[PDB]
Structure 1
Amino acid sequence: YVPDEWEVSREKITLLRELGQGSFGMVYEGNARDIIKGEAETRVAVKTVNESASLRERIEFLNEASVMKGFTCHHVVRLLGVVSKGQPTLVVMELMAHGDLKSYLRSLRPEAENNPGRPPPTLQEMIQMAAEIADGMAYLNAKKFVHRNLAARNCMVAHDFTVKIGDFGMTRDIYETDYYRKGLLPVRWMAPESLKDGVFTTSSDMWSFGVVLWEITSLAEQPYQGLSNEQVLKFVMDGGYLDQPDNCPERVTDLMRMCWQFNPNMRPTFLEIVNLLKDDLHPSFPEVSFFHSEENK
């Protein structure tokens, strides 16, 4: 790692509270002073790497930040700055003020003690979420990333309820092996060919996308609840897939069934999902999407 214009002074960052454990260590909510032009102060998420990490891991932490330097998508959580001089090393992100998509959906259940007094997501809101997630994933696919970790908990929710992909889903290649499958990669979100032969492609991400939609419409229940990890592996490898949540919108169901095609070739691409959903989204969508951008080539 070598510093550049992404270097941000430590003293600019004030930390406010722990948000939770990220893949590398504790993530914090904070404030950053003069980190974006036209803004005195910016609400940030600050990633850290925890004490127990090897030097190799510490370098891997910064390399992840390095990769996000080349991402400018409204529907992927963006990097704001890096504090690399001295320890602790800090990776500064746009804050996603409504948390991960899984916890956000759980807050919307009838029986949630942390319920914001708002109704569960409308069909309209759900479709918007889908196109947003799909647009972020399309960007990553164009950048040549296979995510491998698409799940509601890995997607974030902004202040204005925009949903973004938290990261490019960076995993060491070893976690793709049969030992770890049957590990950091979640078997309840995995395509049958990934489960079978460790094939991870943009098509297997589409399968995981379908599970996200299932999480959206079940308000983040656990996929295949009542089955063990061994039972899911077989069930899914034999041609099985999730039942539709009670009174799930038919439009979302049709989207999930497209994703859960056994033959990867028969599944949609992320651009195709955005295309399928594009004609009834928020008027701001074309202005911010990768789909409608000059970069979508």
Structure 2
Amino acid sequence: NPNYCFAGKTSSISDLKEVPRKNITLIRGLGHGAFGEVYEGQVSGSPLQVAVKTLPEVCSEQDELDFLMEALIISKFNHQNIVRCIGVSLQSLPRFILLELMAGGDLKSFLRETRPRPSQPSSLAMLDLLHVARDIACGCQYLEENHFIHRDIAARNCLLTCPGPGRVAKIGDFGMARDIYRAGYYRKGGCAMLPVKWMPPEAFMEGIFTSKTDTWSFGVLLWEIFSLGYMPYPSKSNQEVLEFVTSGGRMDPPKNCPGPVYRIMTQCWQHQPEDRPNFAIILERIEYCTQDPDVINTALPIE
């Protein structure tokens, strides 16, 4: 089996908790992707509710190895703000990875669906946004401290435990990091698939990735959060953004975005990586924003 190393420990398939296929029931599809399905499931021998990620049976050996590595990567993290791997069912087909069920869904969809609307809702506030930001920043700090570069921080890759009050946001997708870990580069993708709009100059120009490249991405995620799920650089294509960003162009504040929050974004988007804050500092700054009554009492725009 292909190995995986994290935080000074090497692991393989045999260290994943295999759960008997007989113990797993699929309840409903949760909006499948183009490669692999995701289901709400239940594990019961007081049953454990889970997300079930599947591997298409029609796939290459490379795809299978990639699937195994995703399981390994996620299983070796230990943090509140990173989705848990409950186990795997690799000894039957189709292969399954069992994940913490994130009933609030992905953060981009959540923001879009829950953004104040001139009708029945308007139950989301600045504090909810700051809490999601802090949650993900905590996860990012953990990755930074463990020398793990995510490479693809973006709202689509963050998940919510539930839609209501008490939601916790967590990093839930590690496909890019997995791809680079296995191949050393984006072998499966190409220019059109790269998350250009989330990448700093040294990443898209030189292919240099560090924790400061996650800092930049996190700045874009912050804009996604505070814009309530808008696509970054809304009027621009990937190449236009590449040109815009390299020449010093940055996004304007999202509508109604408090100054102190936008300032965090602009700090994350410093041209020179050494000038960008690490995640400890980002966390401190988010927490300070959360302390400011003028920040948290700011109304979100109604569509």
TM range (shorter): 0.7 to 0.9
Between Structure 1 and Structure 2, how many residues are aligned? 272
Partner of residue 91 from structure 1, selected from 93, 97, 100 = 97
Partner of residue 152 from structure 2, selected from 149, 169, 172 = 149
Partner of residue 28 from structure 2, selected from 9, 13, 17 = 17
Q: For residue 279 of structure 1, report the CA deviation from its aligned partner.
A: 6.2
Does residue 54 of structure 1 match 2:64? no
Give CA-to-partner distance per residue, 1:124-176, whole Å, 9 cap, x none. Answer: 22221111101101111222211111100000011231100113342243328
Q: Measure, in 2, the Cα distance between the counterparts of 1:244 and 1:199.
A: 27
SS across alignment from 2:185: helix
What is the RMSD computed on CA atoms of the aligned residues?
2.5
Q: Measure, in 1, the Cα distance between the counterparts of 2:252 and 2:231.
A: 12
Q: Measure, in 2, the Cα distance between the counterparts of 1:8 and 1:281.
A: 42
Q: 1:128 to 1:87 in 2, by over 3 A?
A: same
Give CA-to-partner distance per residue, 1:23-67, whole Å, 9 cap, x none. Answer: 851111111215xxxxx2122111111233201211220122122
Does residue 76 of structure 1 match 2:85? no
Q: Measure, in 2, the Cα distance between the counterparts of 1:235 and 1:279.
A: 31
CA contact 2:197–2:232 (8 Å) conserved in 1:
yes
Partner of residue 203 from structure 2, selected from 187, 194, 198 = 194
Q: Measure, in 2, the Cα distance between the counterparts of 1:184 and 1:143.
A: 27
Within-5 A mapping of 1:97-176: 97-110=103-116, 117-120=121-124, 122-159=125-162, 160-168=166-174, 169-172=177-180, 173-175=184-186
Percent sequence identity over aligned pairs: 42
CA contact 1:3–1:84 (8 Å) conserved in 2:
no
CA contact 2:264–2:285 (8 Å) conserved in 1:
no
Q: 1:48 to 1:76 in 2, by over 3 A?
A: same
Gaps of 5+ in 1: 35-39, 283-297
Partner residue in 2 for 1:180: 190
Q: 1:255 to 1:29 in 2, by over 3 A?
A: same
Gaps of 5+ in 2: 2-12, 292-303
Q: 1:281 to 1:92 in 2, by over 3 A?
A: farther
Q: Measure, in 2, the Cα distance between the counterparts of 1:224 and 1:277.
A: 23
Which shows bigger deviation, 208-217 or 60-69? 60-69
Within-5 A mapping of 1:198-217: 198-217=207-226
CA contact 1:29–1:44 (8 Å) conserved in 2:
yes
Partner residue in 1 for 2:236: 227
Q: Measure, in 2, the Cα distance between the counterparts of 1:116 and 1:11.
A: 43
* TM-score, length basis structure 2: 0.82
